[PDB]
Amino acid sequence: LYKSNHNVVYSCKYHIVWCPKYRRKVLVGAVEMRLKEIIQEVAKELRVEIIEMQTDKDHIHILADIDPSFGVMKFIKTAKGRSSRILRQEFNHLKTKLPTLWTNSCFISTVGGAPLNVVKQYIENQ
Amino acid sequence: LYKSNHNVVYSCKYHIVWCPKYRRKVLVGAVEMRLKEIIQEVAKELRVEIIEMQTDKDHIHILADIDPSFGVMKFIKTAKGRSSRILRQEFNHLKTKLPTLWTNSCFISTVGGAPLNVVKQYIENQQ
DNA sequence: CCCCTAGCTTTAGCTATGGGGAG
DNA sequence: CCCCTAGCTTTAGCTATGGGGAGT
Ligand SMILES: [Mn+2]
């Protein structure tokens, strides 16, 4: 459930989705395997909580908990950016067949239900 | 439902709650009236979408849509900070009875349900 | 709507409530 | 757990995945 940063009590979870360039179904086999590895590593390094993360031929789906003071875009930037660089060094076709691994676009959807009774305990905890 | 910033397709809504210092029930009458006014003004200025916002004696409750690239804490900072300064200039007791209007704490809860079928249209919209 | 730019990491490749520009 | 600091607006009063020092 909830977690607390310096004086900020939060529960922030997002549904993030992004596709490779031209929607090329390259996220398969060893590539999708490596992709998830690097993102988990990034998440640990950026204190991001990876909840759900399944990969599909032409897109990835991540559900993460991120400190509102940190920023979703910051996580996405390291995720997309590092993956592209690292992958393009291992899987050569990613570099030759595509100018970049990803696009400058992503899908962000906030997830969570109105947590009544947790609001009241917060208030009384003040 | 969804809005698009430069290449980012988003739907980010938060439930924000914060209380005045010492939980002093000062957010009533003309004070609560002015509080909501200023926040609405701030929201317009920061392109924040004020959905729900009711005030209570010892705490405010806001439900807003915020561009993920902008940041929730940025909106919160301007909201708490501006309100505190402006209010304490109008309602004198707020300055004399309290050292500051708010505390350095707030409650942030993400709200929204898994939008299947919007995910797919996004993907297919990627050409 | 697209190419450029500054900012920052991956020092390559992605973000910036981004910018300026058609005509 | 708290007081200080830099950053930024409100130029007062609030944030910073904040900091550093005392600390069951
Ligand atoms: Mn899917």
Side-chain angles (χ1 to χ4, degrees), chain A residues 54 56 59 61, chain B residues 119 123:
Chain A
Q54 58 168 220
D56 299 344
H59 69 221
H61 229 124
Chain B
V119 180
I123 302 140

Side-chain angles (χ1 to χ4, degrees), chain A residues 23-105:
Chain A
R23 295 180 60 185
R24 204 59 55 83
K25 312 168 183 297
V26 291
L27 304 178
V28 290
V31 183
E32 75 150 302
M33 184 176 260
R34 287 281 279 134
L35 189 61
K36 288 181 289 185
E37 297 172 14
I38 303 174
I39 293 188
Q40 278 292 5
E41 179 186 69
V42 164
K44 284 186 288 288
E45 288 189 37
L46 301 184
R47 313 176 209 171
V48 178
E49 205 68 271
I50 290 293
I51 298 176
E52 177 189 89
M53 175 175 69
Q54 58 168 220
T55 324
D56 299 344
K57 302 184 182 65
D58 72 323
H59 69 221
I60 184 170
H61 229 124
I62 297 174
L63 177 58
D65 172 274
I66 304 167
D67 172 27
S69 295
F70 189 58
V72 201
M73 292 316 299
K74 207 160 183 176
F75 170 45
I76 295 167
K77 167 157 44 190
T78 310
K80 285 168 78 74
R82 188 184 286 179
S83 61
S84 46
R85 204 283 183 284
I86 293 181
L87 290 182
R88 281 163 62 101
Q89 293 184 116
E90 272 64 88
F91 310 102
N92 179 269
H93 58 284
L94 287 175
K95 178 203 167 189
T96 57
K97 201 180 189 183
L98 304 167
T100 48
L101 211 187
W102 323 103
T103 59
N104 61 318
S105 174

